[PDB]
Design a protein around this ligand. Sequence first.
Ligand code: Y01
Ligand code: Y01
Ligand code: Y01
Ligand code: CL
Ligand code: CL
Ligand code: CL
Lengths: 377, 377, 377
Amino acid sequence: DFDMFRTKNENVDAGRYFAALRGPELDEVKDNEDILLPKEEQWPFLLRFPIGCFGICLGLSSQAVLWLALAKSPATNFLHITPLINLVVWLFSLVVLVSVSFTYILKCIFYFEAVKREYFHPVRVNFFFAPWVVCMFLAISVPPMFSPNRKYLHPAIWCVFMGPYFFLELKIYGQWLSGGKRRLCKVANPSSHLSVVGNFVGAILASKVGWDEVAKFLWAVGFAHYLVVFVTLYQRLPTSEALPKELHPVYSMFIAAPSAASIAWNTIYGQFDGCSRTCFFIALFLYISLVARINFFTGFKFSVAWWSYTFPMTTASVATIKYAEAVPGYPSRALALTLSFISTAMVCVLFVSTLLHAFVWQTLFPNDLAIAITKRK
Amino acid sequence: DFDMFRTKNENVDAGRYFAALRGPELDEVKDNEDILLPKEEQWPFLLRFPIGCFGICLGLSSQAVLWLALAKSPATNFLHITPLINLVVWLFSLVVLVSVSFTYILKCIFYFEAVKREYFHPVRVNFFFAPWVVCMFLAISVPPMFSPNRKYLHPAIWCVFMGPYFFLELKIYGQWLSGGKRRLCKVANPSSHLSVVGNFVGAILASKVGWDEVAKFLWAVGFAHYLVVFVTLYQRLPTSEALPKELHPVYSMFIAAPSAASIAWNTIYGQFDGCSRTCFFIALFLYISLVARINFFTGFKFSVAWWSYTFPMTTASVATIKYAEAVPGYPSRALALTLSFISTAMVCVLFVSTLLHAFVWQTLFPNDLAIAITKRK
Amino acid sequence: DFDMFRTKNENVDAGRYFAALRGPELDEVKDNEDILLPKEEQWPFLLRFPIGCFGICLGLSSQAVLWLALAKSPATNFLHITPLINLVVWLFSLVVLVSVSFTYILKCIFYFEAVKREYFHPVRVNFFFAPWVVCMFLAISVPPMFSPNRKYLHPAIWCVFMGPYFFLELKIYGQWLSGGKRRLCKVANPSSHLSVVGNFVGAILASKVGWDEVAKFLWAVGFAHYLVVFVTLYQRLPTSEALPKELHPVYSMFIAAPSAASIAWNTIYGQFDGCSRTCFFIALFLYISLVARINFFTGFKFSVAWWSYTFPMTTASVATIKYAEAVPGYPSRALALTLSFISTAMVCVLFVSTLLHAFVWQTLFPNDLAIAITKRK
Ligand SMILES: CC(C)CCC[C@@H](C)[C@H]1CC[C@H]2[C@@H]3CC=C4C[C@@H](OC(=O)CCC(=O)O)CC[C@]4(C)[C@H]3CC[C@]12C
Ligand SMILES: CC(C)CCC[C@@H](C)[C@H]1CC[C@H]2[C@@H]3CC=C4C[C@@H](OC(=O)CCC(=O)O)CC[C@]4(C)[C@H]3CC[C@]12C
Ligand SMILES: CC(C)CCC[C@@H](C)[C@H]1CC[C@H]2[C@@H]3CC=C4C[C@@H](OC(=O)CCC(=O)O)CC[C@]4(C)[C@H]3CC[C@]12C
Ligand SMILES: [Cl-]
Ligand SMILES: [Cl-]
Ligand SMILES: [Cl-]
């Protein structure tokens, strides 16, 4: 009954995924579709654990970077924040990463057919890049107590975390520019921004190890693929529910890239110039359009994907503290504090609601029917 | 007979507009379409006054900026032009703006159903931005006689004219990036450039009031939406007559944005550097392609839209006088004079022909049948 | 039998070319198509000489620039290369250009109907720009022995070679932005990059004659048309074989433009800054993706188009020697030598195989059936 997904269902085209699945994330089966697995009896645990549980790590590792700059930035020195907030968040986020990583490796050893189904899913494919972006955020945020009294980190740290990321993006980018079944015009969705943001995060790590020329190379590659993905989202593409007819929290993924580019540019050249200010000012316009409404707060439903919509907001807050240093004053101090407060509050709500579902309602790991769709209809 | 358009016809999709209307501006009914109003008997005056009469103001307020720089620029000081040309043009343009604004407000108070029809017209929608761009050109061009002996203008002038413009563009830009019925790929036309040029014109006004950081923010937003609209016009879009098969005066709208960006960049940083020279040199290439032909002059027919094709040519002339200051010489003096002469001559022809039609042929306000199309066919 | 192609078959739409032709270059007739000429009897010689024999000149004139920098660059002065390699290659390439040019002029005087068929071919149209790019490479590479002891060249050389190129691109670019039958979305192919690279090559020549402002203007125009052609190749276009489903040597045409822009920028401003490093670093990423595989070498078949895939690789090597001067060291010396060796080896293989086919197998000038397709089907 469950032996088809066990380790030893051919690769289904992305068109079938868009035709049989509905929703902003393609995680629900339509009403005329038949699945290959039972719909009522509980499934094995390792078959209902999605690849999207790595988004919790992205939401906690990005909050450690923010609180290290708050307690050390010259623009925030009027308040006195203890350095122990970064220590606690940095240790807590590391524990969660190890638990999520160890559980997914077990699934690959026992259920490898289900892992291949998620790889070919047009939306879930971008979450195979997130395991390495969480490790780069944790390395540019190490608590001073644990850091050696040296100016630079060992270059071997950059090679171990940016190696697999570069290998994966070499294959994916080649497919985009070709005329195959998996070209950008056939798969491009709002979540396709996770395969670009990792170029700018790795540029910061390269500078911190003493390799400035390598950082410049990674900035140029991330810049060429963000404009292709940014202009491609305004054209006519496959019809589906991956593009909500109204403004919906999924559009926050368009802010991560510009904010990280501004932060990465200021670290390579030492100053917040006309390039970082343009990157920072593009991401700030998008922040207002998505957050300056009243339905953004009134309409809020819990989901595991919510953990992936908060990390692009905590990154825009890190770039606002760098901008306040280049332009000292009261207009900039208030802007930095306002964005930081909103991001932290959004993460506190998700923390409480996640525990209530797990140990008070027991509805956090339902069956994953989106991976049992038929290949032919 | 006329009570359906009176103040108290549902919102028709942009597809219906493209299917029932023909021409470079979508102002004529096809030969198989039926209208909802009489086609022979004269209509009420307020029902045949379009929103495109604000283009006359754009053609006269942009000519006052040119003649203030001609009499004050160091590169033009060999000729001796009286400062009284700017005074006369500046006062004349203000009178026309007040008369056009007061007449359209009356239509909204008595015929509000016809105003909503123009708002949803894919081409006429961009002319709701023009009432504020005419007021910003008049504020950066005030005749010295009326100006106070101070270095900066009061910041309240910027807030009163750029406030409504920012509010309107927040709503429109949000629709472009969503998956609704009014996304750019469904409505994008050559006239869609009027909703972007106002970001660069407001950046100049911000600098003149002492707010340089605000000007930089408005430059970044205008730059992100011009590349989306510039690359989107080369793709496959709804089939209609909004894109002439040959070069036609409507393509002059592609020059306004690059010329204003170069002028706005030189005011924020004080020098004509490698950014202003690239913006200026892109707009100059387009000027030659559209004006260096012989059919541009042989084929000329009077229209009220002609008043909206001249303002992008008078702006390219203002950027040519700024460039002549950074590069003094005879090659630059001749270039500035040549472009200025052509723009002024084009506006003199429209001035005489407009009066002849009004008081010698009485054919300037025909019935507007493009707003009476049926919603269902 | 051959009188229809003789000098005195209407202009066939680009759609017919894509529907009746197959292959990465549109040079083979499909299996259900009928031709207008005999398929077995040998044709006249002047009717089987394509416009793509000018690609041999591009492969030999670009190799003279490389070997002049190797013997004169400060970064390569540890090795001692004789200046006589540039002299021999420069003289040999000039002889080939004169022979190819004289043969094609004869065809136009006797077979003008076949020349018009190649002009309207969506792929062969871009090879009408190559006759002038070969003359600009030969003028920025003149052997010192033949050069006058002056700092600058005569400006008349720039006018005679860049005049015809500018005239041709004025007409083509106008068609792209219009709504006609030959707009970019209807014809855009990988070979469309040859009509843009000539703007950057002419900028270098302008600087060498003392006209720096003219060079800046040509850089801005080439930059605006490369982003349109670069983003347009990721959209949904006419279905055909012009876009191979896998990585194929034809994709090397995407490297020529970025490499020449970096070289041209360093000559206008004197230094390899953050603009040349971004252009250079984008072209280097594409080089790895196309050359760092094992099927690039195992799968190699001789073709006359191979001569047009090597010139974009010899240009990326010229930009690597300029970068090694701005960043002296051993990491940069090895990179420059590695790319130069590969480009030279690829050209030596094509040289031997071209002579074997001509005088050992007699299969170098087959009948050109792609120009005899019917216009109606
Ligand atoms: C990467 C994503 C987030 C997009 C945001 C930035 C980009 C759109 C790039 C492309 C063009 C760049 C601008 C183009 C040219 C310049 C001039 C550049 O060099 C100068 O000439 C110095 C000017 C000065 O500061 O005086 C200063 C930065 C700036 C404005 C650039 C800022 C960054 C821009 C907007
Ligand atoms: C806004 C519309 C009208 C488009 C026209 C301008 C843009 C296409 C931007 C994006 C990239 C920019 C260029 C990219 C990088 C630079 C380097 C920039 O910074 C430097 O490195 C200084 C170089 C120098 O002047 O020495 C100088 C301006 C320039 C050429 C920029 C000019 C403005 C460009 C062409
Ligand atoms: C032409 C093709 C091959 C594309 C490759 C280059 C372009 C994508 C342009 C557009 C935006 C440009 C960049 C945008 C802004 C700048 C800042 C510009 O001006 C500065 O502010 C100086 C910064 C410094 O060097 O300190 C320096 C070059 C650079 C990075 C530009 C490099 C060239 C870019 C990437
Ligand atoms: Cl950081
Ligand atoms: Cl001004
Ligand atoms: Cl050279």
